Amino acid sequence: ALPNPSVPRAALVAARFLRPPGRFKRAELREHPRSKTGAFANLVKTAVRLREKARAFSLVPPPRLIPIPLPARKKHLESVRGVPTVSSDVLARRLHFLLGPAAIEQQKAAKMQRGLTPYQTELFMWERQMREIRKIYRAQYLQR
Amino acid sequence: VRHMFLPFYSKERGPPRIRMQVAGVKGKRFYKIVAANQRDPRDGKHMEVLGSYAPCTPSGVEELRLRFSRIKFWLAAGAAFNS
Amino acid sequence: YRHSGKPADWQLPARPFYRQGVSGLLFPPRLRRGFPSMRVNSKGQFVGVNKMPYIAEKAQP
């Protein structure tokens, strides 16, 4: 309650690679009026409101922790669990298409869309091709 | 197999990226291709060195030394690069 | 090639260099370059690392 407020688990796992704010960014939140405060987002009330709601009811005692020595264990090599099951013959031909002359002409033959520049049509088409090569290399590295 | 690239990613700095560097002596600068994060400085911490690049050489032809066994491995991890 | 102007298959080999001519090691050490930016976990799986490489790694055999 006091340490950690009510935070849904869905929004905690997703926010993993979120970079923390800087020094100036922190002052923005602290500056009045605090219009960035959400529902039940108060840093003064949230820290005591939760506690009181639980006071009426019983409190589970903390778990009993008994010290126990950990047994020794030696290092053991294990095979790779993730190994895509794909034949090497299939990947050999796929590499010749993206790196071959056919890739250059494929980008030109693309359908355009309203509100987009001519260069954007080819850029997006090239990006999709770049996604396929990453998987091919990843599968080959794991197999070897 | 995303578990194998966890250490690479940095929360404070950012995701990995491929760029160049500027080092050497004044008047004879040469580019150095390395792997680092997004917010890392241009000349500072680096994860692995891929190679170098010399746009100006005595022979007049631009040279380029790179590792064929490392660039392909890094791309699979999801490393972006500039245009 | 001359006519087609494409690279050939057979060509000159590499040109390794040795210090003072001697190219023999009797007690080679165990280098750490076998698994660049990769290590073994408690489970046995392969995991990466985040460290600055040593500038004189290859110069200290």
Binding site: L95, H96, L99 | F68, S69 | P7, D9, P13, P16
Partner: peptide, 23 residues
């Protein structure tokens, strides 16, 4: 046969150098 891709030719040299050092 007739390795046209740059990647195939690049890997050919690596194997040749390693074979000489192998005894």
């Amino acid at each position: 046969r007739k390795l046209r891709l740059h990647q195939e030719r690049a890997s050919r040299g690596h194997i040749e150098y390693l074979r000489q050092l192998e005894r």
